[PDB]
């Protein structure tokens, strides 16, 4: 019912806070790369991108859970 939407919104809030942190790191590193080109800075930017991809995977898991619940409701 509504508690399911509540828990989905909570999961989204936590994921989006982690997104905020990763995005701030990514923008800081991009400014640093613009001002000075380095290879290790590019490596840590790639690490940030990997973190963002893991976040995307978590969002996909949330979506598949909600989809299973919707498919059970429609039955």
């Amino acid at each position: 019912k509504q508690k399911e939407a509540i828990k989905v919104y909570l999961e989204l809030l936590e994921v989006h806070s982690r997104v905020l942190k990763a995005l701030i790191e990514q923008i800081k590193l991009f400014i640093e790369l613009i001002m000075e080109p380095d290879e290790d800075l590019a490596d840590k930017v790639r690490k940030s991108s990997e973190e963002l991809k893991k976040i995307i995977k978590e969002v996909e898991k949330i979506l598949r859970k909600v989809d299973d619940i919707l498919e059970k409701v429609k039955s």
Partner: protein
């Protein structure tokens, strides 16, 4: 009681060296102070007479008397505080070049009508007082003396920010880098370099002891060294974007704290049963704020993209 102290020092000075120019000037200054009801001017005159009693028949005492008279003439409280700090520096560090330089800087500050030069000179004097016998004090005093001469207000703001950075983190690489950058910016006649240095110093103050701060300092140094105008505008835009990113980071941290508190409150309300519609409304408010912060971050991302191209 301050009037009593001033008059007692006046009588002590009159008994110390009568029939001298310093004695007559001290008597007249003590009279003009007794006429006053302002305690700050009373402290000014007290420090002046204390310096006179400290060094009788000297040039420093004459400078102190003249500066104290000109400060009593002024109605601005900031000039009063500046003269107080200058005379107090002369008292704390006698027989030092910094005392004479600070007296000259305080005279130049009182003579100026601008309100920002008073703050700048007060900051320089506080730097001298808190860090005596240090290169930072002399460099800050020289920087303030150079800032008073410049016509541009941007130079005043830049030197204010540089002295602030020095006071916040003394004996750090950031402080000496900010001092050198502010000196080289005051030397340059260009105002765009002043804007770049101001933005870099603001980046430093917003995020002290961070990688962004030192990176922006190095970029501002190499931009002051450079002579390309397009790269100068690009550096200005990059520094503005960095400052916006710092502000957005603060906002995002506040939003994350809100998210944690909302999760706690949601679990508490689910345990208690206090109903679901109000919880959904609070969740909607928090989601709105967080997603607006995310969208601002995306906009800054696209702005950076436009800058690099």
């Amino acid at each position: 009681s301050e009037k009593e102290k001033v008059e007692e020092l006046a009588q002590r000075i009159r008994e110390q060296l009568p029939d001298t120019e310093l004695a007559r000037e001290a008597q007249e200054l003590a009279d003009e102070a007794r006429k006053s009801d302002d305690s700050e001017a009373l402290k000014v005159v007290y420090l002046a007479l204390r310096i006179v009693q400290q060094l009788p028949d000297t040039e420093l005492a004459r400078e102190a008397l003249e500066l104290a008279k000109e400060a009593v003439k002024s109605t601005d409280s900031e000039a009063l505080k500046v003269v107080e700090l200058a005379l107090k520096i002369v008292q704390q560090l006698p027989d030092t070049e910094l005392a004479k330089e600070a007296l000259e800087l305080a005279k130049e500050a009182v003579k100026s009508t601008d309100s920002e030069a008073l703050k700048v000179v007060e900051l320089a004097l506080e730097i001298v007082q808190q860090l005596p016998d240090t290169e930072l004090a002399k460099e800050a005093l020289k920087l303030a003396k150079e800032a008073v001469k410049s016509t541009d207000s941007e130079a005043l703001k830049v030197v204010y920010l540089a002295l602030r950075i020095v006071q916040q983190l003394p004996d750090t690489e950031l402080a000496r880098e900010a001092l050198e950058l502010a000196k080289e910016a005051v030397k340059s006649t260009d105002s765009e370099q002043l804007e770049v240095v101001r933005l870099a110093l603001e980046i430093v103050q917003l995020a002290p002891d961070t990688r962004l701060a030192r990176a922006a300092l190095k970029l501002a140094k190499e931009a002051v060294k450079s002579t390309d105008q397009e790269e100068l505008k690009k550096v200005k835009a990059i520094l503005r974007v960095a400052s916006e990113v710092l502000k957005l980071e603060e906002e995002a941290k506040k939003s994350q704290e809100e998210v944690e508190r909302l999760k706690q409150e949601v679990e508490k309300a689910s345990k208690a049963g206090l109903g679901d519609s109000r919880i959904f409304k609070k969740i909607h408010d928090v989601v709105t704020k967080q997603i607006k912060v995310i969208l601002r971050l995306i906009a800054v991302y696209a702005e950076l993209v436009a800058i690099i191209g």
